[PDB]
Structures are given as structure tokens and as C-alpha cells.
Symmetry: C3
């Protein structure tokens, strides 16, 4: 069975648009905790991290809000490690995707052998020197990869980071808006990815088979799922900062998470980039939040074929 530890991370400064800091609020409001308890789930809420304002945080080169982002990730790393040591699956409600530096870092402190599945339209693997936007939500993976040590300058706020994963310990699914330096890094480091072209070619069934065999083939190990709702098509998750057409369908997102649940190895989860302020209508917001909740419930066992308890229902 499996214990869950919820962490709200109401944090937006990895990117410019306000509102993503409300994700933990609208996800809770949608009844996530109660719906989780409805399943097999032993659920503990660790609350919303209080990220204090860092008023003096001028860019580093063109990298924006570095001290704010670095410290939020440092704090979240602390908290995720606590949840993990408490023997629970960490569930980070974001918040922008820069928080993955802290979520994966903190997870890896307790489980260094982890493997990551990163579901996103974007690779989020720019370095401080290849970014053109300066937004740290487009860089988290570069901070985490050991191969890119040497390439990450000393950015204020991140002196606490130690790269904890190798290029062979991450798989991307969903990619369709990748910068040229990012694509170079993928090919140079030999990272495993299923862009939307591969999902089209192979079908999500084969994509998950290969994703899981790639990560678990040699031996089982904890899985970290970092799910950016912008990996799904904007027809399902429109309330997000950077929607990109041609995404994963609602079905594909449930398929990915149902298969990860079935491994019994989910160890940490990020549900990121929900930005209620950016829905064009109230219904775009509920659509987005509802989809995120459904993705989350699938991670913890909710199955489209149905579920039952180990009793005899014919009484």
C-alpha cells in the first residue's frame, strides 16, 4: 500500500506570469485530498510552504529571480526529503516547474537511485547560458544532471545544489517545443525522449513500455514523475502559461499515469504549471484543474476499468 505526503508549493518566480502560485489552492479546492482518501490512500498534508519574499533579487546575467527560485527549491527539497523519510510518496502541487530542482533533489537525498519521467511539452533543460528567456522554469533539468556540471555557472540562490541524476536516469514524454541548445544537449548527452513524433509513431502503449523498460530494465528503483500540465493538449489543460498545440490527449495522460501506478514504484510526483488566472473563462479553469486532479488520482490507483476492495461484492 501507499502513504502520500502532500506539499503545496505556491511559487511562480521561475517564470513571469502570476497565478501559478494559486495551483495548490485550486487543486485542494477541487477536493483532491478527499478524493485521494476515497482510494486506498493514507494521506497526510504537509501544508503549503511559506516562501518568503526576497525583495533584492536582480537578474544573474539574464536569469530572472535566481535567489527566489533557488531558495524555494532549497526549501522544497528539505520538505520532500522529510516526507520521503516518513515513508510516504511526495506529492508536490505547484507552482512553476522550476520547483522540480528542489523536488527531485530532496527526493534523491532519500532515494539516490531514482529514475525520472518528465511529462511536458518542453525539456526544461536550458542552462543559465543557453536560456534566451531567462525563466528558470525552462532550466531545472540542467541543474540536476551530473553531466552538465562544468556548464552551470554559480547562480546566486543555487549554491546548495548538487546534481543528483545522470542523463540515463530521465525519460521525457510529450516534447514539442524544444530550443536548439536544448536539442543539442539531448543528442549530446544521449537522453531518452519520446517527443510527440514518437508518441504518434509508436502509440502511447509502446511509449510507456519502452519508458519503463529503459528505466527499470536493469533493476527496479523509485520513480519520480514530474508532470507539467502543459504536456497535455491545451484542449484539456488550457490554464497554463505556455500552451502548445498538438499535445498528449486526456486519455494518453491517464494512460501514462495508470501504467506508472501499476509499477508499484511511484516514489514522488510533481503536478506543475496549473495557472488558474490564465483560463479564458471559468470553464477553462475547471477543465484544467479537473484534468490535473484526474491525472493525480490515476497516479495513486484510480483505474478507468474500475477498482474494488478485496471483499465479495455479491455479498
Amino acid at each position: 500500500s501507499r502513504t502520500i505526503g502532500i506539499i503545496g508549493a505556491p511559487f511562480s518566480k521561475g517564470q513571469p506570469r502570476g497565478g501559478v502560485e494559486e495551483g495548490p489552492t485550486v487543486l485542494r479546492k477541487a477536493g483532491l485530498l478527499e478524493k485521494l482518501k476515497e482510494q486506498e490512500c493514507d494521506v497526510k498534508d504537509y501544508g503549503d510552504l511559506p516562501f518568503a519574499d526576497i525583495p533584492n533579487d536582480s537578474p544573474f546575467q539574464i536569469v530572472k529571480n535566481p535567489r527566489s527560485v533557488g531558495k524555494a527549491s532549497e526549501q522544497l527539497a528539505g520538505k520532500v526529503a522529510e516526507v520521503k523519510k516518513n515513508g510516504r510518496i511526495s506529492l508536490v502541487l505547484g507552482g512553476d516547474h522550476s520547483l522540480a530542482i528542489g523536488s527531485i533533489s530532496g527526493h534523491a537525498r532519500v532515494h539516490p537511485d531514482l529514475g525520472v519521467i518528465w511529462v511536458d511539452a518542453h525539456t526544461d533543460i536550458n542552462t543559465p547560458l543557453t536560456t534566451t528567456s531567462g525563466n528558470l522554469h525552462g532550466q531545472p533539468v540542467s541543474f540536476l544532471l551530473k553531466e552538465l556540471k562544468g556548464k552551470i555557472p554559480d547562480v546566486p540562490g543555487f549554491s546548495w545544489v548538487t546534481p543528483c541524476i545522470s542523463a540515463k536516469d530521465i525519460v521525457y514524454i510529450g516534447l514539442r517545443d524544444v530550443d536548439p541548445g536544448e536539442h543539442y544537449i539531448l543528442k549530446t548527452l544521449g537522453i531518452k525522449y519520446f517527443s510527440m513524433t514518437e508518441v504518434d509513431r509508436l502509440g502511447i502503449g509502446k511509449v510507456m513500455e519502452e519508458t519503463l523498460s529503459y528505466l527499470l530494465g536493469r533493476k527496479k528503483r523509485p520513480i519520480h514523475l514530474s508532470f507539467d500540465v502543459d504536456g497535455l493538449d491545451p484542449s484539456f489543460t488550457p490554464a497554463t502559461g505556455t500552451p502548445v498545440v498538438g499535445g498528449l490527449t486526456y486519455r494518453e495522460g491517464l494512460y501514462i499515469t495508470e501504467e506508472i501506478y501499476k509499477t508499484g514504484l511511484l516514489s514522488g510526483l510533481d503536478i506543475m504549471e496549473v495557472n488558474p488566472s490564465l483560463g479564458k473563462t471559468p470553464e477553462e479553469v475547471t477543465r484544467t484543474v479537473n484534468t490535473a486532479v484526474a491525472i493525480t488520482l490515476a497516479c495513486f490507483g484510480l483505474a478507468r476499468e474500475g477498482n474494488h476492495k478485496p471483499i465479495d461484492y455479491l455479498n
Copy 2:
């Protein structure tokens, strides 16, 4: 070739929302009969069954309108058997899905070796004792399965039922909202199903290959297709009582029916749960009705690749 016998079943008391009794009307209004005649089809309209009101019909335990539902199904069974003895494919226009008790029962009187394909978001397999809603459209399959004799109390209106199918003679496609007791029954009886997870994994092509091989592998036999429009995604069939997101696409529904047509074994068909009152706009209604008509025409040979008569068109 193939003769068709249309039966309207303007009946709603298997569930609470009025309007599904108008399905036969809007389907006819959309020109179904004429469009069928445009194909190879020898089409006879048996009219709309006149279901008299049963004013005294208080629940049985929590099961609602049992006498009404039982009698409508009894009457429809009578009529479907007549059509079948007339050597025609029965085409039941519903009406809520509780009518499948009568449609499959009546069909089986003439062809006891039939196999059923049930296309639906729901399994509709609660018994009177596992239902929580009391709505009989969520129970028809339990009345039909021989294995569940012993488990179906004597519900008023259904004393005429005799279970006519075994668990191994039905396949579900489309499932994504299954109650716990229903899931227990599926696993306990070893029923064959393709939930949306399986359709995602395998693709609708392989789903139909396996569906047909499972039902026809040992020997050919008549097929009964019970098609609930809520099996399709609400973006195609919104005017229905219980829409569930993440459904079969329009393409997938045509694929299912094109492959069943190609077997030459379609023997009876139900087109159920169209509820024009529930479209949010006139266009949701026409969208739903149009999709239902297209599904129906595919059952009788309309092919997306095209069709021609056995003449030389280059004259």
C-alpha cells in the same frame, strides 16, 4: 445481403432524465430510414412501440420504476423476436439502455448462440443489490447473464426474464466509469473487456481484432451490438444523460462498426441513450444525432473508403 427491421423504443424510465424517449423521433427526423435505403438496405419500419403508462410502480428496494422497465423490455423482446423471425437485422432506436434486457432477450429467442458487443462508458452490470443509484439502465447485463442467476432477486416486472447469455459471450468496449461491485463482477466472472486503458494501449485496430476473435474464434455466430452513445466522447455525443470524458473518438466508433459490418454477422443492433433535451445548444443535439446516424450507417455497410455497386462505372 441484409434486411433491416427498425423498432422505435421511446422509453426513459430506466433512468431519471426525461428526453431519451425522444431518441427514436430525432433519429428518424435526421433521415435515418432514407439514408439506410440509400445503401444496400431493404428496410422495414416496425414503428415505435407504444409503452403504456404504469402509474402504480413504486420502487423495489431502491430500484426505480421496475414494472415499467420490465414491461417495456418484455414488449421489446416480443418485437425483436418478430423482426428476427422475419429474417431481418433488428435495429432498436432507444430509449435508455435498460431496453437491452428486452432487445438481447428477444434476439436470443431466435438466435440463442448470439454474442454481444457492448460499447459504453459503463458496464451496466449492477444487480438490484449492488446498484447504488437504483436506475435500471445501470443493471441490464446482470439480468441477462446466466452466472448471475441466484443473485437477481425477484423484481416486479421481470418474472418473464430468463438469462440467455454467459459471461464468455459478451465483450465490452469503451469502459471508463465502472462501479466497485461491477468491477468485482467483471473479474469474478472473467468477462472480456477493453476499457479505455486497453484501447489506449492496443489501438482500436487490435481491440476489434481481439474482440471478434474472442467471440467468433471457435465458430461464426450472430452478433448483437448494443451501442450506448455515451461510449463515445462527449465532444461527439454530448446529448446523453451521463457523459464521461476521455471516450472513444468518432473515428474509433466508426472503426468498431465498420469492422462489425465486415464480419457479415451483425444480427441485432441497439442505438441507445440519445437524449436531445440534454444538449446545451441546438448544435449539441444535431452533433449527437448526426454521430449516432453515422454509427448506424456504418453498421449496415457505409465505408469511409467509399462504396460502389457491382456495375462498371467507367460505363
Copy 3:
């Protein structure tokens, strides 16, 4: 590498609805040329052909505007051959699909061994005698096929045509609205096609594998892609004269074009049937135009997984 020669073909008389003659304009306005230059592309604009009015053009039998259509195609054939002799990939911006007579004809003058991929809801293979509509955009393929010589009357405006392709040198993808005489021609001539039924069965991955192996299996040869935006679902390309539900998705259209790009054999391209006047709203127009531009950029190398130049980005 690959040089491109853009040709605008603002022409509508292959069908009744005005507005498709504006396709080259809205595609250019959307920044196509600049976006192409952003890729590897050496881009030369050959301008918009000036199609003079032919005021005296009464139907031939029921075939409408034959002299206008024939002459526009004659002029376009001239220009495409020029671009091809200039060692560039011809990119025809339409305009209605009747222009394919000229585009493929002109291409074949320079590369007679070409193979055609025709992406469309329709086969566009009626002859002047099997058409029921009289619209020449529903006939271009019949004019091009050698096997149908004998079956094409002498239509005024087309005396310059010489059939340049065999039935075995075309593959259709996307088909879902095929007339009976057209279906007869497909089966009689043994043309290779993937209707939407086949795309559903096999998946677009296998469809392209088979399409390319069928055309290139025996030996590499130039590819002509004739892309009718109505091959995509109207939820992506609504501003078109004859939308048909159940089409190829945005993903599938990018998949088709990404795979053709990867062959290195794209030799000519048609982007047809964009009709901005027919969008129900301004957003339907931009949606359609945007999709067409994305399809076009994929033909010339834009990849969803990303792209980089052959430099070291980690500097």
C-alpha cells in the same frame, strides 16, 4: 540541403466558393516565407501567378469553368517546371485542388519518375463523366493517370495535358468522402490508399512506413506531396470549402510531413484549399492558416523533437 521556390496560385474556379483564391495571401501574411528562412531554407518567391479572367467559359457537359481551370493549370505547370529546373523544391500555395493537374504535370516534366502522396478527405479522381458536381477540384487525378486515357473526353482548356503518372505512383492518405465511381476507379486500377479506416486500424506510424515503402521500395525517386487541408479534421482546418468530420489530427498531419521531410526526397509540395472566407469566426481562419503553416514548415525540416545547427551549443 534544400532550396525552395514559392509559387502563389490564387485560383478558385475548380470549385464554386470564392475565397480560396486568398490562400496565398493569408499564408504569406502569416509569415510563411520568414519562418521558412528561419530554418535551413534558401527561399525564392516566384510571386503569385496572374491568372487572367476568361469571361467566355460555359460548362462542358456539366463540367464548370473548364477553360479557366485548364489554363490556370497550364500556367502553373510552366512555372513549377521552371522552379524545378532551378533545382528548387516547388511549393504551390493554393488555391483549389484542381491546380494539382498543373503542379504535378509541371513537376513531372523535370522529374518523370516522381511519386505522389495525396493527403485529402477526397480522392479527387472523378472523370468529366463520373463527376456529379462538375467541380474540377474533384477531378484532377483522373487527368493525370495514364490508365484513364481513353476515359477523359477532350475538355476545352486541357488539350495540353499528357497523363504523367501511373496508378502505382500515387498513395492517398485521409480518405473519408469518396464517390461510388471514384471507389470503382480505386479498386479497378489497384490504387494504394489509406482511408481513415486504415489510419485507425494501423496508426499513422505504420501508414507512413507502408506509404513510403510502397513508393520508394524499389528505388528512391522524387516525392510530390499534394496536401489538401481538408484532409485534416475540421477542428484543425475549418476554413475550407468541404470539411468532413473524422479527419486526420494535427499530430497526424505533422507526423506525415515530418516523415516525408526525413526521406530527403520531397521534390514538390501543394498546400491547397485554404479558404479564409469560410471560417465562421476570425479565430477559425487563423486556426486554419496556422495549421497549414505548421504543416508546411514540417515539410522543410521543423521537428517537434527540436532542431539544432551543427555547432557546439555548450559553446
